[PDB]
Symmetry: C3
Subunit: 533 residues, 3 copies
Amino acid sequence: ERMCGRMSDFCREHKTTLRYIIWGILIAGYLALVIAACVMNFHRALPLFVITVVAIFFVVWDHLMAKYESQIARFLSPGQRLLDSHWFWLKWVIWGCLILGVILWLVFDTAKLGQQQLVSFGGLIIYTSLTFLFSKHPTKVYWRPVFWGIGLQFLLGLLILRTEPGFMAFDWLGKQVQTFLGYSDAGASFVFGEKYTDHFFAFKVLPIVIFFSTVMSMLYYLGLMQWIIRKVGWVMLVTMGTSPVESVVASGNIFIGQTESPLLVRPYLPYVTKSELHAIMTAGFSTIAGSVLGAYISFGVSSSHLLTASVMSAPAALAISKLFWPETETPKINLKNAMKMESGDSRNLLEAATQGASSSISLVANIAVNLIAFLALLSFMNSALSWLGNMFDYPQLSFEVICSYVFMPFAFMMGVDWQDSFMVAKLIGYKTFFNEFVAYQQLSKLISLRQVGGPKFVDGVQQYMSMRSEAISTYALCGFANFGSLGIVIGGLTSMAPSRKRDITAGAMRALIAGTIACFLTACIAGMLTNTP
Amino acid sequence: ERMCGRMSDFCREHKTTLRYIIWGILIAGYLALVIAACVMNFHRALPLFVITVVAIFFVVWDHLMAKYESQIARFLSPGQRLLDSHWFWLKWVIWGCLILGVILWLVFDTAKLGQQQLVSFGGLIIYTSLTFLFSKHPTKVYWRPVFWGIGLQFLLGLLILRTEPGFMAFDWLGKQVQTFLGYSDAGASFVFGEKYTDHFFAFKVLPIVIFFSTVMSMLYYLGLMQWIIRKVGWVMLVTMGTSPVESVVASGNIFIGQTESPLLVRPYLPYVTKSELHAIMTAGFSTIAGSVLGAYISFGVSSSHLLTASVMSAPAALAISKLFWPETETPKINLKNAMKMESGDSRNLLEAATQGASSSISLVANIAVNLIAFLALLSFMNSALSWLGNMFDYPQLSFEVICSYVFMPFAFMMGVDWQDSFMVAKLIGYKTFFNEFVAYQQLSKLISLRQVGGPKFVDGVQQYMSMRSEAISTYALCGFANFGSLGIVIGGLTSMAPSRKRDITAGAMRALIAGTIACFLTACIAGMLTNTP
Amino acid sequence: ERMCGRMSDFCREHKTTLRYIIWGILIAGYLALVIAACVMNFHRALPLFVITVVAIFFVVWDHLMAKYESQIARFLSPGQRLLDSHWFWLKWVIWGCLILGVILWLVFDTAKLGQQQLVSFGGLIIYTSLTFLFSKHPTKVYWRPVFWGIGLQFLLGLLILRTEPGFMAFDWLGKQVQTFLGYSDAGASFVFGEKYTDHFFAFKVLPIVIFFSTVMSMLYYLGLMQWIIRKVGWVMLVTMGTSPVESVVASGNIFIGQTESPLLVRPYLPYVTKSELHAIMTAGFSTIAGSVLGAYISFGVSSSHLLTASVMSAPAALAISKLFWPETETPKINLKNAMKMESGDSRNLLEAATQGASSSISLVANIAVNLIAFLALLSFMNSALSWLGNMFDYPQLSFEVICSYVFMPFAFMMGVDWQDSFMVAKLIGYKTFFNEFVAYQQLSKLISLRQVGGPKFVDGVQQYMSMRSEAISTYALCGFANFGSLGIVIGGLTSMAPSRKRDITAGAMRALIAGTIACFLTACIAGMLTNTP
Ligand SMILES: CC(C)C(=O)OC[C@H]1O[C@@H](n2ccc(NO)nc2=O)[C@H](O)[C@@H]1O
Ligand SMILES: CC(C)C(=O)OC[C@H]1O[C@@H](n2ccc(NO)nc2=O)[C@H](O)[C@@H]1O
Ligand SMILES: CC(C)C(=O)OC[C@H]1O[C@@H](n2ccc(NO)nc2=O)[C@H](O)[C@@H]1O
């Protein structure tokens, strides 16, 4: 007993020192492994060295910003005062310079490019103007968020699309994600057998969802997802000027689904303003989760375009939310509270994986059931429309025919050519009435037909569309904005914050419209920047 | 801002006028389409014209009955008083006339028909007498509901079965329903692949359930299901004399399942009397839902017989409930409250479809699990019974052998011939211990063997049975009365009305017996009316 | 009415007499059937006669012990006092005799057996010593439970393994269970089609779980499971000296899973001590359910070893729980309350089957989801470890390689030979990080390779291992102790007794370690008793 007591006392004495010592030993062992690998053959060992270097750089940066924050603020203070003193005369100069730059760039580049892209820019203008017309509080609007959002979208798009180094990186990331979920496809062979490929959607696509949920929960427990979310949220906050919680939500949505995103700010959901709740719902509707990314890349959709669309959507979502529905009341929630996100209550990584996996049981079931019902309804609608058409001697009438004409103007404004606008309109109709999955499937079919080659027109029917139309379509459909999505979103938001039910419902409706408009804006920018093949 | 305010004021001014104007414009466009179709080719366009005419007639009738209700009641009042004044002497005359008519019809028709059907009528008498013997409150019974229920069953059966125009209509309706769920079968190919037919029950039959649930929810939101329920309920109410809620429930059950039917009167479930709760449960047990109709018609079961059985069951269910368990306490619920049914709380048709689809997730899982367990138990029972029989030198002993002899008297009383009564008894045993699905499958096998042709007896074993036996079997098995059904029914009823738990449990037991007896009565009438092949 | 009243009065008069009369008539009919079968052909009829005889014997024994308990206690009292008076000097004599017997048996048998088994005994000693070192309350420990637990394990193992009559019985029982769940496999063909074998795990293995749950619920309603649990619990109670509830739990766990076992003492869970809760969790972790037994026997695992391991585990679980974590507080719960187990609230056998089946819906879903996620994670881990290894010119690095070396000492102490210890270590790693299902699958592969024959080493890689190693592996892996299991166990225990949350969590962690150690002890004993092939 005495020896055990002495050992316990020794353990109590060295607690912090012992933990630091063991962590340091582990890190030193990792560094030794890295250096041995570099010694033997540097060319193979390069990735590990790069990862270690970037991690060290980020840790050093974080520590310095923490400790030296006051000194940096002191250094920055004089310049802010000097800018404020001269701001009155300088604001006009800055605005004029920006306008002149816009004019020069637009003329030279896009005029050397063609008409369709000039039309894309016109569509950008039209969408923004319309949102300003039908805003909830048109008189009181802050234009800095809108302008900065559009500018940031343009800069990101320009870098990623018109530069070779930028283009290669996203391709690499897409390949990584695709392989990462391919690891999932193999793991599900055990449960459903080697004949799981017989039923593709049920035994490949949904298991991908399951694996993604588990991985995300583990990373949440470790504390990485949070880091990336905080960085991007701080960027948006320091530039767009939005409130804290909405920026945090938007950054999270980039790689998180609509249902799980509000849980980031769950504790403060009761106290949020109506505008911030609208922003949350709009961000949820305007961006897709990471789970669907691997599947969509597998279909044939470009990885670079999908990732760029997801990244660009969040700033656009916030900008459109502010313009469509601006804030009229003071925000209670503080920056420190919002940025802080409570970690999982579980006790070990494996418990977090288990809990994350169990939650997915509901989502998959609801998805499968809704798909069954809505596709059956589409079949009934097509058969009945054909029956009605036969009366007027047009037996070819179908859902696709009405939705081609109804949605054509939106496609034309986005910069798609006249011939392909109808084909894009069919996909938009599929996205709005049904999930983006069906629409992406149809798009993949058109892409595959283009790649195989053959007659553009088998008969007076066009078979495949041009590459640029496909890129614009990729941007236009990268959202969770559906009518069934509206219901589940409302239900979840009401669950988390029972007090705010009616505010949640009212936000939902306008939010979905804002999300679709935000999705259109990214497509307009992509059309402006992508060259005609 | 001023222009927006002026537009909002103009919108506020014209609200009702604008809505009426747009609805009128839409209706006029529909009528123009109809008339154009009729102009070009009337023969093709006939269905649309017929639908429009009947819809207009019903709307006019409803409006007139609403506005002119007082005047019609005033016109009707004198005749009621005149009848009441002379009722004392006239009641004996009416009863004698009815008895004489019954005797004459029975003699001529059924005597020219044969012995089996006279036995069917005898079975009708026997079942009613037995229910009167074992009633909860034998002394206090109202005979008008019982007699009127039997009479209405007889009239409906006579019209539908012995008249050619009546026979054709139900065949047409069955074909419509079969095609309607065939639309479902196609829609489920997407999720489970084109090899979904490999697993027939899992990937065809259950998806049919899903599609039916979605369609029913949409129609509920639109407000059609409610209209039909109200019409049939009013008929039963004005003739049978039952209380409001039970009539409403019975009309709904005709095409609604046992689990969803009480939700029609959910708000008033706490306050219902014991007799009305027994009536609800009996109606639930005695009738089948619309989802199973398409499958059962697909197996080979006749559409006309299935639909006629479902329609006839509800009046029989109410009559048997009253005779078996009569009311001893005053009914609180009013007609207006009961007939009114709150519409779905959802916000658009698509939300209603989503919500209806999500609910079906539980039902399908429970069905599949119960089927797995109970069929495995049947296998074990057969193997053990064979093992026991081998001891006594009868290795052929099985579940079917015991259940052939045990249930034979019921089949004989229904009018089935002696040879086929055993075969029907096996099916009845399957229905009672297991769901009607298995029993209908066996019945379909026997029907198919009859249609193929061949030896009636391969050896001293009969292979197929006569057509009339199949019709009587179709009527006898059209119910949800099983022991597993008893449990889920009790659970759901207890959930909706927690206060009434014990009353719910006591009602359940007697209710199932009443339901089975009601199912037998329809078969007796069918045997009386169907001719010997 | 009067006749009904007279009949009701007559029924009231004869209630108990009538029930006894009918039960007696049924029993007499059963006996007549037995005697007729014996008359015709005794050889065939033997099983029924044996069952009847044993049932009669047990009923007579129970009745006599009930009625004559006081007289038997009176007879036993004098001997207890005489033993107590002389106990002071006699305890040393008894202990010395036991030690001498242990020495003689060990020397003769195991010395004539070989080194490996002497090492097995050494491993037994080592595990017990280590548990004594790291006990929660080392100073206060009661050694009688530990010693008696080890002794009872040894006696059961000796009888079952070294005697031919004992060996045959468990083989027979395993065949019975395997056929019993094979009945399940047939029943599931209806739902998933005859092509259900295409997806083996989803449509065979999980349906086995469903059928087992249903059968267990039915037997619980009838009252058999309870009888067996009570008998074994009384044995453990009268010998080990443990408290009532923990003994009852341990006996139940032998054939009940970790999740359902605490429901036996659900009403008293709030008031249990910390030590008893630790014992409950340890028993849950150290034993497997009956559902998995049929599957594991199907893989190729020996029936006799599996059943013996399950039986031996519970006494070991209690002993290890006491030594690892001893009780420091008085036990409130009484023997009578604990032994009594409330029967199911349902109303008939079929309701109990339905309720038992519905509960299984959650378990199967969670199992499938966790398997998908964890196997995908294993794939990712193997690929990344191979990538890291390629840097150091060892592309063969994998999960199995690390886990072979890490767990080798445990396998060596259990008595496995040096060459096969690594192979066993891989299986132990699979069991700890993933469910025992995967590990048993790998073990079945090794057994099948041994049976087929061929090169022991294809190259410097061993392909199959010796029979004794397989037996020790069978004992070592017969547990539910996994990390995912830890989470669900904690969740369920917290649900049943919300007051005890923190005590539940603290018990869980130590409990899992205790369970694994208990699993090792049974393997050590098996190695001591099994001869070298
Ligand atoms: C998931 C794929 C295979 C699919 O075909 O289903 C699409 C529907 O699934 C919703 N969805 C998706 C992911 C998520 N979190 O990762 N939460 C959601 O709600 C989403 O809105 C859409 O409607
Ligand atoms: C549904 C078919 C494919 C089947 O084989 O299953 C039969 C069992 O399903 C119950 N059932 C059915 C429909 C319903 N609402 O539409 N509610 C229910 O409870 C019903 O009682 C019976 O036992
Ligand atoms: C069941 C087989 C096919 C399987 O591969 O799954 C293994 C996992 O299932 C857990 N399990 C099992 C039975 C039970 N009651 O009978 N309760 C449980 O928790 C158990 O712990 C293990 O982890």
